C-alpha cells in the first residue's frame, strides 16, 4: 500500500477489489434467449416493471436475458448499473441493454441485437460471460490480504 496508508484494513479492501479480476460469469445465475417480439410488453410477466420504468428522468424480436445472484453481487463491489453499463459499452452502439435496478427483488439484464439472430444472440452470450471483464485486471485471479 501507499506510504501513509498501511493500516486501513479498508484501503486494503479497495485495492484488492480494484485489482482482482471479476467476470460476468462469477455473478450470473443463468442466461436465456426468449422470443419476445414486442418491446413494449414482455412475454415474461416478471419484467413488466423493468419495461415500463424504462422511460424516466432498430431492436430485434429476440431477447437475451440474464439473471444475477444478489449475493455474488453484494459480495464483490458490484451494482447492476456498474455491470449493465460495462456490458453496454463493450458493444457500444449496436446492442440495446436494459436491467432492473438494485432495488428490484430480482437482478436481471435484457439484451437485443440491432435474418439469423438466435446465433448472434449466443456467440454474444459467450462474449458476455467470458470476455467481458467487470472489475479488476486480467490474469489476477485470486487476491489475499495479509498483515
Amino acid at each position: 500500500l501507499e506510504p501513509g496508508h498501511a493500516a486501513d484494513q479498508e484501503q486494503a479492501k479497495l485495492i484488492r477489489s480494484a485489482i482482482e479480476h471479476t467476470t460476468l460469469k462469477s455473478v450470473t445465475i443463468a442466461s436465456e434467449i426468449y422470443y419476445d417480439p414486442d418491446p413494449r410488453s414482455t412475454v415474461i410477466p416478471e419484467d413488466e416493471e423493468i419495461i415500463q420504468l424504462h422511460f424516466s428522468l432498430q431492436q430485434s424480436p429476440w431477447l437475451l436475458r440474464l439473471e444475477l445472484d444478489r449475493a455474488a453481487m453484494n459480495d464483490k463491489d458490484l451494482t447492476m448499473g456498474q455491470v449493465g453499463e460495462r456490458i453496454k459499452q463493450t458493444f457500444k452502439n449496436d446492442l440495446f441493454v436494459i436491467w432492473s435496478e438494485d432495488n428490484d427483488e430480482k437482478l436481471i439484464i435484457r439484451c437485443r441485437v440491432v435474418a439469423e439472430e438466435d446465433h448472434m444472440l449466443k456467440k454474444i452470450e459467450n462474449t458476455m460471460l467470458e470476455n467481458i471483464t467487470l472489475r479488476g485486471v486480467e490474469n489476477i485471479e485470486r487476491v489475499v490480504m495479509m498483515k
Partner: protein, 122 residues
Amino acid sequence: MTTFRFCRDCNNMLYPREDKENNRLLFECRTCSYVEEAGSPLVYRHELITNIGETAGVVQDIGSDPTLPRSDRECPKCHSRENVFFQSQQRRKDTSMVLFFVCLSCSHIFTSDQKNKRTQFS
C-alpha cells in the same frame, strides 16, 4: 427447461423462425418443409449455477446397495428412521458437502441443507 420438438413426417429437428406479420414463434423443419407453432417462447437456457445432478442414481433398489451410509432421521413425510444418505452427485469443485437422504420406506428425498432452495430436488 428447454424441451425441443421434432418434425412429424421426417422425425428431424425443428428450428425456430419468425412470423413478422403476427409476431409469433414458428419452429420449422429445414429437412423438408414442415412447420408448426411453439409451446413456449423459451429458445435457450444455459444455467451457470446448475442444480440438476445432485439427485442422481436415486433408483428403487438404492436401499439394497451396501456401500451407502445410513442415518436414522425423520423424513418430512413418513416419519420413518430408515434413510440412506449421500453427498451431491454433482462432481464439480464448488459443490457443497450437503447431504441428501432417501427414506427407504416412502422413497422420498430430503436434504440437510438448512437453506433448502430446491422444491423438486434435481
